[PDB]
Symmetry: C3
Subunit: 238 residues, 3 copies
């Protein structure tokens, strides 16, 4: 590590604040749910925001930062982003999976692709060459496309077998994931990590802040909005 933060810390704190607020919202919002199913959604969702909050606090306090050397240039890498995504992105897919009524093979595929995506993603963040970093960015992006392919394909088909409100709910959440998630690689390739520095680290941090907040608190908020629709994921009594 041994890297100082910078003016971007403003976004890091807003992010930390937002994630912490979403968590408390979901904790109180989840208060009183007895249905074992509705609860899953609250647990998964709540863990997504608190993890994100802790990592944002890590980058804010300067813990989740480091300096990576690449071609007579020292890039500033906020690695905590990966420790965050490594856990939160698969959970988000879990949410979608459970929402769509998908089976373990599909959900396992999604999780597997996702982890491969963040893993090759952090390799890219630390690679020692503009060529190597972009190669890895390329591997990781490929995986993103492979999992998005599962979302619009098999997963979408599963959701169509769900009650209409659930299917609708899925559609929204799926489309949110598609637009938001595709933006991450773009912000990365343009930002500091891509070695091209087209998008200043200050604005890159902000971009990731808006994305993370929308992909987690926003996502969670529309997911857990209605309790009755969410319990249509299952019909029988228990």
């Amino acid at each position: 590590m041994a890297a100082t933060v910078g003016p971007e810390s403003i976004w890091l704190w807003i992010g930390t604040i937002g994630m912490t607020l979403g968590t408390l919202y979901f904790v109180g919002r989840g208060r009183g749910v007895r249905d074992r199913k509705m609860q899953e959604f609250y647990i998964i969702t709540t863990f997504i925001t608190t993890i994100a909050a802790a990592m944002y606090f890590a980058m804010a306090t300067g813990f989740g930062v480091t300096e990576v050397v690449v071609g007579d240039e020292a890039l500033t890498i906020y690695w905590a982003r990966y420790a965050d995504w490594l856990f939160t992105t698969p959970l988000l897919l879990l949410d979608l999976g459970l929402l769509a009524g998908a089976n373990r093979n599909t959900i396992a595929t999604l999780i597997g692709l996702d982890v491969f995506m963040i893993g090759t993603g952090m390799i890219a963040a630390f690679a020692a060459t503009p060529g190597t970093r972009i190669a890895w960015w390329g591997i990781s992006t490929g995986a993103l496309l492979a999992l998005l392919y599962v979302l619009v394909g098999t997963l979408s088909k599963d959701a169509r077998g769900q009650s209409p409100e659930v299917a609708s709910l899925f559609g929204r959440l799926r489309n949110l994931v598609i637009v938001l998630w595709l933006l991450y690689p773009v912000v990365w390739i343009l930002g500091t990590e891509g070695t091209f520095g087209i998008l200043p680290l200050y604005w890159e941090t902000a971009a990731f802040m808006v994305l993370d907040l929308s992909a987690k608190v926003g996502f969670g908020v529309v997911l857990l909005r209605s309790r009755s629709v969410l319990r249509r994921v299952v019909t029988p009594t228990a």
Copy 2:
């Protein structure tokens, strides 16, 4: 790393020895169990002690040590403790979960809180500021309280629906966890990691040695004491 051990190694070896001995005890003690349930308890428990043993051996041989710089002072951090707890603590909760007859949402919550606890715990161990380290210690301690809240609440309620001997067994094990686990953060805050050095590293190592041994070998010994009571966790035939 690049840090030398010290006089505390005596405790590290005792610890290594104890954990290795508990393992062999459980391996031989588990010999002959056919009931698929009783076995779970033996597998989980046995993995707890061998993991602990390997990590204790790691700290003993000097592998699991490092030097962390914080405020013109170089703290000695035994990070292997975290690699240990990261795996053993969730397993211990698995044991309690299975013992109480808890459902996946409760057990998943416990595991999730626990991992968050050790994760923020090791961040704290490496933070670069007395203020940051204590902040993280604070986050981690909060999580400890959140999971303890689940133990005395929901988990205790589940156990009351179990056969009386199992409920009794739970009570003991739960109370053991509560008293022992609360002591870890105290030993940490007072020891070297807390930056206050109130409790010498030599005695801190001993304290953690007694705790780990009691929280694993002791715990295991009272858990796997009786085979008949343990099989009351399930009633039907198989």
Copy 3:
């Protein structure tokens, strides 16, 4: 890190190429399988080769390398091997487990031993003393023997309760694992990591290349060879 590759890179590329080719083979080979079971085998298997491919590409580009100091000598460690095995070896056992018709306790034991094996294995790769490295090599090898003991024992017994073609298929795959897996520790102890340098890093890289390819692409190829036999792992309709 900060370590340069070397003439061994030739094997690393062949390896990268082979793993990538096996993956595409399995992806296309898995095209059209609807049976939820047959699919598991394809997903698990496919993830094994792509993980291996990415790690081989990591070592090829020099990312997965580092220099470890031990006794006035600086060893060259290809750590990516461990990040690879940490995920692929447990998956391979999953394949065998599912093939044998084993229960979760057996499969969990296998996975647990396996992870302990690679974990102590990478510790050994980084230990600071010929004596410590070999001690860990010793711990890890012990675990290898413990899991091999489960393969020829309980796992083999489970497979005998399977349809004959499945039992046969198991036998092959089990024997392949036994001969191939036992060779890893030998190649390690003789290679650079063992501190004895009996087997040059150049040939060590090749040896591991042949093993990895045989233990994954070979293994996969004989596993997924026949679709009908693989669906005999389950009989009823779904």
